[PDB]
Amino acid sequence: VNSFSGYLKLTDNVYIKNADIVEEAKKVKPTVVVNAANVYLKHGGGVAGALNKATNNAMQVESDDYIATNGPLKVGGSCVLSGHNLAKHCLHVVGPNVNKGEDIQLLKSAYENFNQHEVLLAPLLSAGIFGADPIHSLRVCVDTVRTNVYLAVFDKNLYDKLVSSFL
Numbered sequence: 089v090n091s092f093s094g095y096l097k098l099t100d101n102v103y104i105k106n107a108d109i110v111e112e113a114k115k116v117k118p119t120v121v122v123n124a125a126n127v128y129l130k131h132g133g134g135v136a137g138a139l140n141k142a143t144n145n146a147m148q149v150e151s152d153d154y155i156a157t158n159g160p161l162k163v164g165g166s167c168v169l170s171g172h173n174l175a176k177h178c179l180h181v182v183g184p185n186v187n188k189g190e191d192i193q194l195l196k197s198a199y200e201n202f203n204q205h206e207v208l209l210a211p212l213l214s215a216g217i218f219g220a221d222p223i224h225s226l227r228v229c230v231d232t233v234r235t236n237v238y239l240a241v242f243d244k245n246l247y248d249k250l251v252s253s254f255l
């Protein structure tokens with residue numbers, strides 16, 4: 089038993105809700121919140137900008153030190169950093185950005201990072217400003233992640249569409 093509420097159960101291990109991940113994170117305090125990161129951990133907009141804003145820019149400060157030490161992530165890769173006031177940990181995961189020409193097949197590799205964590209609150213990778221089809225992203229999620237994932241979908245219209253078209 090865990091503390092997530094009002095989720096719809098999609099599969100054995102995937103759940104979905106219409107929620108603001110920032111507000112869900114601050115209420116739940118999950119062990120892991122996933123950020124829709126880029127390779128530079130520049131959290132300027134989308135989910136990343138919203139999560140970073142909710143940390144009062146502490147996420148960005150920590151991220152800049154991470155990059156200065158380690159260099160950029162790989163597309164499809166991840167790193168674990170602090171969750172600040174939102175979660176114990178933040179798993180920064182880089183899905184391919186279609187608006188940058190990156191290969192969509194890397195979306196499966198991105199979701200594989202979730203399997204290193206027993207339970208996660210997450211957005212749909214490569215959705216939103218990353219330019220992928222969120223329905224596709226949901227299919228890859230369901231077919232790749234084996235751990236328990238609670239998907240927060242900000243847009244109510246999108247949430248209805250994803251549920252109604254789910255196979």
Ligand SMILES: CC[C@@H](CNc1ncnc2[nH]cnc12)NC(=O)CCC1CCCCC1
Nearest residue numbers: 108109134135138211215216222240242243
């Ligand atoms: C689907 C991925 C999410 C990722 N962004 C966030 N996801 C969760 N919580 C957040 N808080 C702040 N941002 C987010 N994007 C959207 O919902 C934008 C609207 C749709 C509608 C048109 C087609 C794609 C974009």
